[PDB]
Design a protein around this ligand. Structure first.
Ligand SMILES: [Zn+2]
Ligand SMILES: [Zn+2]
Length: 84
């Protein structure tokens, strides 16, 4: 077998040069919900509460045509001792 350990790095202070989604601070809202009258992203319409909602696509020319599943990552995390 094998043994390995690791920690985690703090998210980089995102600049104000790119508006993201509320729930998802990574996906750039590329859609807009009519019923909810609120800008949403792909993840919001994919699995988000807007699963079967009526959104009005923005980008005329479909960009994301093909769709596949991305390999999921499995990591660990647990706080330990410390001093000052
Ligand atoms: Zn979203
Ligand atoms: Zn909605």
């Amino acid at each position: 077998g094998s043994s390995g350990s690791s920690g985690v790095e703090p998210v980089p202070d995102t600049h104000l040069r790119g508006i993201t989604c509320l729930d998802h601070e990574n996906e750039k809202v590329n859609m807009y919900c009519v019923s909810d009258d609120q800008l949403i992203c792909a993840l919001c319409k994919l699995v988000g509460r807007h699963r079967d909602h009526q959104v009005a696509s923005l980008n005329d020319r479909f960009e994301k045509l093909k769709q596949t599943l991305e390999m999921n990552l499995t990591n660990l995390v647990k706080s330990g001792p410390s001093s000052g």
